[PDB]
Amino acid sequence: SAFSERYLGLHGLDNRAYEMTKVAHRVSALEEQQFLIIHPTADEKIHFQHTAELITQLIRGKANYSLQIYPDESHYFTSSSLKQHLYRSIINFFVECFRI
Amino acid sequence: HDPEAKWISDTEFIYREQKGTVRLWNVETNTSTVLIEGKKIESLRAIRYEISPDREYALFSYNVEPIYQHSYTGYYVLSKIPHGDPQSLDPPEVSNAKLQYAGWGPKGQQLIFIFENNIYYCAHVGKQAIRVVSTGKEGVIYNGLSDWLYEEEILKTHIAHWWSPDGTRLAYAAINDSRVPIMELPTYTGSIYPTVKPYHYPKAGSENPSISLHVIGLNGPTHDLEMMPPDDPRMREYYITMVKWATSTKVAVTWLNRAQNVSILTLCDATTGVCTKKHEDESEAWLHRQNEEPVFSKDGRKFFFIRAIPQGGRGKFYHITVSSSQPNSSNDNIQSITSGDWDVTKILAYDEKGNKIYFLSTEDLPRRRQLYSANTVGNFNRQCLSCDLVENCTYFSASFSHSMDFFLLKCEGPGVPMVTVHNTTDKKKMFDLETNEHVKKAINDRQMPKVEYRDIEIDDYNLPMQILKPATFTDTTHYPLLLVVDGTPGSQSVAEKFEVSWETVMVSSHGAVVVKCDGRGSGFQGTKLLHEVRRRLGLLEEKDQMEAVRTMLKEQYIDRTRVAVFGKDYGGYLSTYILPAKGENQGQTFTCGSALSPITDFKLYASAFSERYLGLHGLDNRAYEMTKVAHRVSALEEQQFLIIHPTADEKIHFQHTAELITQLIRGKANYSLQIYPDESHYFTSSSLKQHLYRSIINFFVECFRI
Amino acid sequence: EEILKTHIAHWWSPDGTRLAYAAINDSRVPIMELPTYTGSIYPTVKPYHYP
């Protein structure tokens, strides 16, 4: 709530400030973009439910994507191995999507 | 559009919908009577319809919200037999409510219905619902239904109640889950604060549900009487894998111990509830074929139960055994009616007015099923009734009537499926009940893949194997290899069944060949080639698959670079366990690998599956530390891999994937992943299924194309 | 995480004699349960108040 009401106002009275903020409006097209998501299962800041709703909307829109999931990890990756694997994974995804 | 007609009497069958209305046939001379019009479309789209046994009422089940493979809970509405006057079935003192199961009786208009695990019976349809049993409790105490473990693992269905032949008493199994451990599945879509869904899922090394059999009459006090199982020291924990009415008051019940190595078949009488032990069956590894119901004659004479006779070498095959009503305790009359290098898939019925027992069996090949008739007297003549009476299918499934004079036959592959009426007297084809004419023209509309077969032999074991090709093959072009396996016990991946799936579409369009090889541990192909996988589930059949690849890589028209594997459920393990690096040079066995709901830690799975094949859990059998592909999937240096798994899976819990993922993080191996939030494992909806079909081929096309 | 962004919620007096500390009641805050998989054979969700 402390973040939502800061930029969209108090909720509970149908302020009409959240319907357009859902990303499902823009992710409809996804013509040829090789999209990807990386998420930790136990994320305490941005809940897994956000990625779940995005995946549901993507399934409804029938787009192409790949997903990587960290099983029961925290948010900021205060483990050296976790950070190393994360940077390796993003470097990979970008190099296989930049290969010509 | 298969009507799947049911023989009401000696000369009539149900003839359910094929293109609309529900009509009743008469075998005498092509006589048809419409019982239900095309009003099911306007009857709120009744999903499943049944008729009263006296052919006087029709029951419609609609608005179904499935929760397991067969848990079609919904709304049940009765209606008059001609048409008109719908009436929503209701529980006592309650308005319309969702129903777990109602069913129909064998005679009259009497019916039962199960609401919130409580069976309420009505002898008269006009009579309101009355209380018959109330011990059931939501999710913990059942009555006539099966929980998850009993629904899909051992009983293989949700039918846990049996009607008496005269429609006088009901025999139901009550399941107690009070001491059964409870596991919750996450919800990611419900609301702003989604909550997990908890249900009783007995894992390996846990307490199985307490099953108690009970009988209740349909009149008077309806006092409940339970049947006492035997009391051997090694079967106190038991499963009621099967039960069948011997007569209207005598019932035959099967008890399989917790170690599932001893199965006692028993008679019980509902008047007093005591059970008279009949026979016991065991083996060196385990018991098998726990749901073959023996046929009990009109006079209660010798039932014909399939069991393990030694059958010479290659293990103890499964053949029929004759047993009288009251065999002497000194010695029974066990007699092998059938004998050969095969078994009997199912027994239809025995002609009481003669010697003609009809059964579907594998007399020709383990991968083909044929109808046959044997003689119950010393002749023992297994005559052909079907025995390839149709040139194309050579696959069969038959269903007889009360006199078994007239029976329905179904081909179902490799050609377009056939539905036909036939008689055991003349073996003449009066007319085809359903021909799938749309499928008949469609099979020639497009370029269907051509099928090939190549039997393999390893050590003293024979292994069927099947191949598909795009049927427009050119020797110059190279086509990649795709290997699909299941490997689960009691299955046959290499079958001639006709089917359209992602495999056929991919073979036709993307230009690839798919190969399926049956491995060790599969049934119907010798019980010796079944029991040898005790505590060694997975390694033998994957060795067989690797040998098949090495005997497929020799083709001049195929390339070693593009080789892919697929799996699902238990095969999800196999699709991950068949990726080594042979030697040092002959690496890159599988370029792109995929699996669905893979299992890696069998101790995180059902007790009835872990203990049955890998050994009893809780004893540290050490098969629970060697059947984990996590130590095998560790290497995976450069081969990219994919996992697809719904979030709300109940067959193989998503935890199995997540732990595996952690190993990959420790393994530092490339992988992909997809999810389906809050979706079951059986893909009820069409959109989800077609999305999965699109996704698998979209993944494969990139990993093959160069 | 959102407003204070500080681990500590108590402040010492300049003379080292008193403390100013904040007490937060979370009972009326709706509770979220984070799913757990790697935990055990029967993993349980971690519950906490997440407004």
Residue numbers in the entry:
A (entry chain K): 688 to 787
B (entry chain L): 82 to 787
C (entry chain K): 233 to 283
Copy text verbatim from the article accompanying this structure deposition:
Native Kv4 tetrameric channels form macromolecular ternary complexes with two auxiliary β-subunits—intracellular Kv channel-interacting proteins (KChIPs) and transmembrane dipeptidyl peptidase-related proteins (DPPs)—to evoke rapidly activating and inactivating A-type currents, which prevent the backpropagation of action potentials.
To investigate how DPPs modulate the properties of Kv4, we solved the structures of the human Kv4.2–DPP6S binary and Kv4.2–DPP6S–KChIP1 ternary complexes. Owing to the flexible position of the large extracellular domains of DPP6S floating above Kv4.2, the overall resolutions are 4.2 Å and 4.5 Å for the Kv4.2–DPP6S and Kv4.2–DPP6S–KChIP1 complexes, respectively. The structures revealed that one DPP6S binds to one Kv4.2 in both complexes through their transmembrane domains, forming an octamer for Kv4.2–DPP6S and a dodecamer for Kv4.2–DPP6S–KChIP1. In the structures of the Kv4.2–DPP6S and Kv4.2–DPP6S–KChIP1 complexes, the DPP6S transmembrane helix hydrophobically interacts with the voltage-sensing domain of Kv4.2, specifically at the lower half of S1 and the upper half of S2. The structure of the Kv4.2–DPP6S complex therefore represents a distinct interaction mode among the potassium channel complexes reported thus far. The acceleration of OSI by DPP6S could involve the N-terminal intracellular domain of DPP6S and the N terminus of Kv4s39; however, both regions are disordered in the structure of Kv4.2–DPP6S and further investigations are required.
